[PDB]
């Protein structure tokens, strides 16, 4: 596969970006074109769950950028590469491995072979224990060691082990039943210290969340759950009614003290990041219900459905990803904004800073060279209107472009003060993609200074300040409701625009190699904090900082 | 007064011809390799009075000598002591809106006279911190009781942007100090968020304080107005209300027509922005949840570091140095992004915090003289605290293709030293680690070597090893503290405060209006009608009226 830059189809856009770049005017778009909405909006029907729109024609696009993106995709592949995906086929090159977290979801059994094997039947039958052990649990059938049914859930995971299930969890609340759930990731102590605080060893259940099982920071705080516990509880043989583990390892679970009968799998096709949809997902499943956890899984199905057979004209991941390369590789912008107005869907930006990141934060090459151009944006945001109310003045009227993904719900779980409050929200909603496109001119500024009665030179000195240059894009999603379904939905067609934009940049999209360096640095200065020695064994900084840490334990 | 255009200003033209000719040749290891007393030249600790060191090392960046001397002669350039003295003696430097600029003035601890309209402004920012004691020790202590007789169990802040954010970043940073008051913290117009607290909460026993300086602020009443519903549904008595809710504000008329008593209102001026107001009335949150004794700890802790930002020659004044790393790498290397990675989980909305101060601040395009600069801002802020930010995004910062400067914090001590302190060590090491990483990388042949040690087919090593290879030269700085307290937090944020400061001074913008914010307000408010009408909209751009006709079509 080429060089991305010697690539005919990056070539012309370079050349049409380099002609045009400047003239790209999007309110100059709108007013020559009374079909540009119709153009550049998608809607996508679901069967229960109502209409998803993507609006994505508030962009610097029209009809000859918009070709040259789709020659793009073209060009790279993308089509055979997903279908390669779908395929099973061993698409994270470095790792040699399957990419198949869309298997986790295959509502309609299809056979998709790994090592010779279907590996339908192995999901089908981790979800049915996550099924039984769930109503277990919700039921009040699973009792701790007093006899006692569990009221909390303790979630103890890193990475994605961690963010998938807070995220969905948090965002799919109006769903919950009566359980309550808890999430430990950090090493810092204070993180299981204030969620210990909050429990009553003989009614809780612990959820150790790690492939490996011998994850350092996740391990640690295990052991010192466990700790926890036994001093309340005293006898070893407890731990089993109170400790389950989302892992592959048997004899390392089993050694921990847990019954491998309560050992939840998922296989090396499973990427972290990629992970909510299977056992990973239990805390999920638990807090609102198995059905509702099929849900969720359906929505991402029809997603992947939609990925798979939309012409690229008219499919949202591929549109998304274009657009992203698009303010990326040709206007340079570093960032990508996740601008969801939905406080539930507070961790949503986070959840994809991983995904995306994580994911195309990268710079070599299927073939070993290493990219002269930009791969993977600095992906960030808050809910609306929080995030409207911090940062927004510099989308507005800063030195960056910062394309943003604004996303709402027609209906709200929430609808206090007869509706009133979801009303002033969705204006917000409107009203912020509006005033990033259109702006407000020199003259219109003054015109509205002039008809408030300010004298001229107050005028003078104050107009430059309230002028706003617009032409700042954004892409609107709306869904009817925000519900297990169409969060699926959402979170799966984020995960095709970040597969399709590691394909265009020829990057794997599915390894994590950059992780490696730190955790090696880690292991060697551990056993150099054990005492109050001064350290001379690194650079003048990491040594400075070590023994001024050690003046002060 | 309006300064050069600064890619005019000669300390600015003489920083780029350097860059110029040596941004390609500046390697952050290889300036370790070559200089023993490195850490030693670009680190500064800071004894406090009580709090121990606070020591930033600034020496995992891409400078030598001659990049610091010029930096520093572009401070003095810019005028950024000047500017400080200007601010710190109420200036109206906030020149748009033609206001003074005197967070500062709210941790005056020494009651020096600061002059506005020809009064001092010490008298007036100091009663209301008397009365904060007053009504903070009276609801903590049970007291104060609610309309049927009950202490207090529950505060509810209501505000949008700097009414909310630095309260709720500041109470969860604290949280080992609180009491045994449960604080919620509602912001969102989002009926959601108000919702979710008014489900946990007993009329009888809330507390409600209303943040909002003209009492007007639409979310932040609409907010107000629906917990004020739901008291009443409670109470059935106007007399109640008085009991169960405050206001932080200045408008007496509107704040006693919802009937709120005006002697349980929080005063502060115009001089105190929102994204500065923490330290102010709009703090009251905090002074309840841990206590007035400890806010003005952490108001001690804040006047510390403004007496540091004004008696501190530049070269070793920590607000200049941050600001004018910042400016290397954003104005020269054109970094867009800044990341703050607080290797603390009670601190996880610190950099959400500084994504308000910095970028709503920074985020400014035109001049002190009304020009359009040709030159970057305020750059986007972001991070998550340590050990969660780094299994996230940490696989960027270190392999893709952005330079991205970060600032890594940590503390000494911990407040939780569970399984005999533990945790505290591997978080430590954690935090070591990165930066030491960041800044050395790993190379085609340290890379190979380890593989080599793998019992690796070399096939097998061929055809990883570019993967993983890292580059490397990727600068931090490193802030370090004994332990988070009230007092090095409020030092902290104050440093930040005046690092932004120093920013703006150089860019020659304002970092203290948001003229930012008007245009959105003024769409939405039009919009309003349109969503409860019955029409077909047609009013607007293409996008926004399809956008308004699929909602409605759902509703």
Same mark, same amino acid.
Request: hydrophobic share 40%; with cysteine; aromatic share 10%.
């Given at each position: 596969?080429v060089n991305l830059k010697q690539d005919p189809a990056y070539q012309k856009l370079q050349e049409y970006y380099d002609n045009n770049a400047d003239k790209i005017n999007i309110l100059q778009l709108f007013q020559q074109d009374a079909d540009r909405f119709n153009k550049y909006s998608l809607?996508?029907?679901? /069967? *229960?769950?109502?209409?998803?729109l993507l609006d994505y024609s508030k962009n610097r696009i029209d009809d000859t950028t918009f070709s040259l993106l789709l020659n793009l995709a073209k060009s790279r592949?993308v089509? $055979?590469?997903?279908?390669?995906?779908? &395929?099973?086929?061993?698409?994270?090159?470095?790792?040699?491995?399957?990419?198949?977290?869309?298997?986790?979801?295959?509502?309609?059994?299809? /056979?998709?072979?790994?090592?010779?094997?279907?590996?339908?039947?192995?999901?089908?039958?981790?979800? &049915?224990?996550?099924?039984?052990?769930?109503?277990?649990?919700?039921?009040?059938?699973?009792?701790?060691?007093?006899? $006692?049914? @569990?009221?909390?859930?303790?979630?103890?995971?890193?990475?994605? +082990?961690?963010?998938?299930?807070?995220?969905?969890?948090?965002?799919?609340?109006?769903?919950?039943?009566?359980?309550?759930?808890?999430?430990? +990731?950090?090493?810092?102590?204070?993180?299981?210290?204030?969620?210990?605080?909050?429990?009553? /060893?003989?009614?809780?259940?612990?959820?150790?969340?790690?492939?490996?099982?011998?994850?350092?920071?996740?391990?640690? *705080?295990?052991?010192?759950?466990?700790?926890?516990?036994?001093?309340?509880?005293?006898?070893?043989?407890?731990?089993?009614?109170?400790?389950?583990?989302?892992?592959?390892?048997?004899?390392?679970?089993?050694?921990?003290?847990?019954?491998?009968?309560?050992?939840?799998?998922?296989?090396?096709?499973?990427?972290?990041?990629?992970?909510?949809? =299977?056992? @990973?997902?239990?805390?999920? +499943?638990?807090?609102?219900?198995?059905?509702?956890?099929?849900?969720?899984?359906?929505?991402?199905?029809?997603?992947?459905?939609?990925?798979?057979?939309?012409p690229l004209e008219k499919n949202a991941p591929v549109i998304l990803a274009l657009l992203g390369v698009w303010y990326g590789n040709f206007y340079g912008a570093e960032t990508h904004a996740l601008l969801?107005?939905?406080?539930?869907?507070?961790?949503?930006?986070?959840?994809?800073?991983?995904?995306?990141?994580? =994911?195309?934060?990268?710079?070599?090459?299927? +073939?070993?060279?290493?990219v002269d151009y930009s791969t993977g944006p600095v992906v960030w945001?808050?809910?609306?209107?929080?995030?409207?109310?911090?940062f927004y003045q510099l989308v507005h009227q800063g030195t960056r472009l910062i394309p943003c993904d604004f996303?709402?719900?027609?209906?709200?779980?929430?609808?206090?003060?007869?509706?009133?409050?979801?009303?002033?929200?969705?204006?917000?909603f409107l009203a912020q993609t509006e005033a990033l496109m259109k702006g407000k001119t020199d003259a219109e500024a003054k015109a509205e200074?002039?008809?408030?009665?300010?004298?001229?030179?107050?005028?003078?000195?104050?107009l430059p300040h309230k002028v706003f240059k617009g032409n700042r894009p954004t892409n609107s999603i709306?869904?009817?409701?925000?519900? /297990?379904?169409?969060?699926?939905?959402?979170?799966?067609?984020?995960?095709?625009k970040?597969?399709t934009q590691?394909?265009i940049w020829?990057?794997?999209?599915?390894?994590?190699?950059?992780?490696?360096?730190?955790?090696?640095?880690?292991?060697?200065?551990?056993?150099?904090?054990?005492?109050? $020695?001064?350290?001379? =064994?690194?650079?003048?900084?990491?040594?400075?900082?070590?023994?001024?840490?050690?003046?002060?334990?």
């Amino acid at each position: 596969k080429v060089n991305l830059k010697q690539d005919p189809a990056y070539q012309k856009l370079q050349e049409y970006y380099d002609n045009n770049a400047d003239k790209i005017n999007i309110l100059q778009l709108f007013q020559q074109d009374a079909d540009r909405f119709n153009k550049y909006s998608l809607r996508i029907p679901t /069967p *229960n769950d109502g209409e998803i729109l993507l609006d994505y024609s508030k962009n610097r696009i029209d009809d000859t950028t918009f070709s040259l993106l789709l020659n793009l995709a073209k060009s790279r592949n993308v089509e $055979k590469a997903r279908d390669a995906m779908f &395929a099973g086929e061993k698409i994270n090159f470095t790792e040699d491995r399957a990419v198949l977290h869309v298997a986790l979801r295959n509502r309609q059994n299809r /056979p998709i072979m790994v090592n010779g094997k279907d590996v339908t039947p192995d999901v089908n039958a981790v979800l &049915a224990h996550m099924k039984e052990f769930s109503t277990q649990v919700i039921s009040g059938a699973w009792k701790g060691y007093t006899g $006692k049914p @569990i009221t909390d859930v303790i979630n103890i995971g890193i990475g994605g +082990s961690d963010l998938g299930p807070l995220m969905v969890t948090e965002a799919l609340k109006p769903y919950a039943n009566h359980l309550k759930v808890h999430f430990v +990731s950090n090493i810092d102590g204070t993180h299981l210290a204030e969620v210990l605080k909050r429990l009553n /060893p003989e009614t809780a259940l612990f959820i150790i969340a790690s492939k490996t099982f011998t994850t350092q920071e996740t391990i640690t *705080n295990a052991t010192s759950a466990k700790t926890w516990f036994l001093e309340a509880a005293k006898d070893p043989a407890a731990v089993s009614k109170h400790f389950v583990a989302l892992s592959t390892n048997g004899e390392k679970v089993t050694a921990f003290g847990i019954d491998p009968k309560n050992m939840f799998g998922f296989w090396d096709w499973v990427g972290g990041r990629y992970s909510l949809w =299977s056992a @990973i997902g239990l805390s999920i +499943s638990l807090y609102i219900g198995f059905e509702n956890f099929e849900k969720l899984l359906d929505g991402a199905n029809f997603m992947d459905n939609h990925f798979c057979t939309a012409p690229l004209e008219k499919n949202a991941p591929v549109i998304l990803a274009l657009l992203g390369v698009w303010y990326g590789n040709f206007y340079g912008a570093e960032t990508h904004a996740l601008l969801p107005y939905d406080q539930y869907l507070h961790r949503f930006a986070a959840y994809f800073q991983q995904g995306d990141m994580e =994911s195309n934060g990268k710079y070599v090459t299927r +073939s070993g060279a290493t990219v002269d151009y930009s791969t993977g944006p600095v992906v960030w945001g808050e809910p609306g209107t929080n995030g409207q109310h911090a940062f927004y003045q510099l989308v507005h009227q800063g030195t960056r472009l910062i394309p943003c993904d604004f996303l709402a719900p027609a209906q709200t779980h929430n609808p206090i003060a007869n509706g009133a409050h979801h009303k002033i929200l969705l204006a917000n909603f409107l009203a912020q993609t509006e005033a990033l496109m259109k702006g407000k001119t020199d003259a219109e500024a003054k015109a509205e200074l002039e008809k408030s009665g300010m004298a001229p030179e107050a005028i003078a000195k104050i107009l430059p300040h309230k002028v706003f240059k617009g032409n700042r894009p954004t892409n609107s999603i709306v869904v009817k409701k925000f519900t /297990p379904f169409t969060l699926g939905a959402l979170i799966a067609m984020y995960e095709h625009k970040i597969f399709t934009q590691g394909v265009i940049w020829d990057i794997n999209s599915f390894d994590q190699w950059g992780v490696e360096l730190g955790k090696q640095l880690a292991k060697a200065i551990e056993p150099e904090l054990q005492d109050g $020695k001064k350290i001379t =064994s690194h650079d003048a900084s990491t040594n400075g900082l070590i023994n001024f840490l050690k003046e002060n334990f």
